[PDB]
Amino acid sequence: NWLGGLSRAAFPKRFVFGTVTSAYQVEGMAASGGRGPSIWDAFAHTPGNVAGNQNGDVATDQYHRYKEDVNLMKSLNFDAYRFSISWSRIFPDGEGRVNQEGVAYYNNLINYLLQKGITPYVNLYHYDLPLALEKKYGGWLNAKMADLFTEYADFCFKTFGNRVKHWFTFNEPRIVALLGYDQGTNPPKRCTKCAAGGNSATEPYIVAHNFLLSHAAAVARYRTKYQAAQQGKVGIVLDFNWYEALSNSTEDQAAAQRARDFHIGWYLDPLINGHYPQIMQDLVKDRLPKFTPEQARLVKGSADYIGINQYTASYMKGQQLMQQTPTSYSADWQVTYVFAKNGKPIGPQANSNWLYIVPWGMYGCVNYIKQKYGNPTVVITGNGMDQPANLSRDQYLRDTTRVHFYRSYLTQLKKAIDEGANVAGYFAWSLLDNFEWLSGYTSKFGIVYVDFNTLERHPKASAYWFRDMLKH
């Protein structure tokens, strides 16, 4: 059976199925409707930064077409929709004046979702820091971000929280730290060798610390001011790809564990246990900021659920841990990536070079969180794969590899849940082909095809797969 035995009956009662987008990747109207620029607007408008010098000015134009898109997700039998609010659409300068037209958009979207029986899961932040805050404060390098983000979050809670009961603060802070401050390939393009300045050995850690403190501050505000009346929940979205020891050697097993700790433990040990992973403390030393006892107590337990974006897996090979001059967050792990074992690749690649199709990584990640962190409530907040550029419409629609991807990965998730993992929901990245950051429109992650000339939507085979799988 093309469903491979999957259906709602194969998952827990009340298990939530949804699709996901982010504001800059789908909304369009980037410089309209009162929206102020984000760091991604400036970045994308700079020649050479994005494939084909493309940007999110129009994207999928969900801003105008959101009722079409909500109708479509309802027709595909989804229960929920994860989307983000653009900070600079609400506060064009990141602070101060409210853009009422932007508020009205999200009200209209939220209300239509609810009208159609689709639960809104709302991210406050998805890489799109208001440009004014980058320039004025230095963005996530500045501890003042906790105050600035908390005030923004407060507004969103007050304005939308009578209707929105499922929030996330951040999306993949590890990726902001890594690409924005270690490698310097994403905004603000900081790194040791970078024109904008930076230090790949220190700044990723400062940035991660400020994300954790800002998350904790925003949640403290929710709990003290809004929770009694609104009775919702606030979590965070973290990326986690699996690491598997290349062999059963002590060294390789240690390397895979170090990778897990530097990847997910960086955020989860603070959120669950109130401290950074021991290995990071041991290796990063004075470059890793230290939580005060008060801050640690604020961060610990501050996520009502853990959003995990899960895509892929890698083999890890070890080495003797050495004393080394610090160079970068990436180099701090002291591991070696390997994508074959016993002469066989870990899996075939999707369009994105980093995305190896490895369904057992889903089981790996979910089981690991279950066993290591006391089985916290987890929501899979993003999982999917991409097709390349330049295919015909019909080639996009016949997305047999993506159908296989979802069947296999969801089978592996089901395996983990059946073994007792506390997973509450699953969200497919993405509802729509969209603006895929540095790849621009050359990477197609949607279950729904978007023609970027006409903006027409066409469900792909994988959309119909979900429709069949999710029928009530």
Ligand SMILES: OC[C@H]1O[C@@H](O[C@H]2[C@H](O)[C@@H](O)[C@H](O[C@H]3[C@H](O)[C@@H](O)[C@H](O[C@H]4[C@H](O)[C@@H](O)[C@H](O)O[C@@H]4CO)O[C@@H]3CO)O[C@@H]2CO)[C@H](O)[C@@H](O)[C@@H]1O
């Ligand atoms: O319909 C609009 C649109 O759909 C697009 O997607 C198609 C797929 O291309 C097509 O393969 C798929 O066919 C499914 C069918 O819907 C299921 O009912 C059926 O499930 C069987 C299963 O195979 C058996 O083993 C099991 O025992 O019983 C069930 C149910 O009887 O499986 C087939 C695949 O083998 O349907 C999708 C949606 O219609 C098309 O590409 C496009 O042309 C259409 O315009």
Ligand SMILES: OC[C@H]1O[C@@H](O[C@H]2[C@H](O)[C@@H](O)[C@H](O[C@H]3[C@H](O)[C@@H](O)[C@H](O[C@H]4[C@H](O)[C@@H](O)[C@H](O)O[C@@H]4CO)O[C@@H]3CO)O[C@@H]2CO)[C@H](O)[C@@H](O)[C@@H]1O
């Ligand atoms: O992309 C689709 C969708 O998903 C969400 O975020 C994605 C990012 O878009 C993507 O850039 C990021 O890719 C990571 C990848 O996970 C790592 O496996 C890879 O690791 C590197 C390592 O950094 C190097 O030091 C080493 O030498 O090589 C390895 C293997 O290549 O690093 C890349 C960064 O380029 O993955 C995220 C999820 O995992 C977003 O939520 C959404 O907005 C995106 O559209």
Ligand SMILES: [Zn+2]
């Ligand atoms: Zn339009």
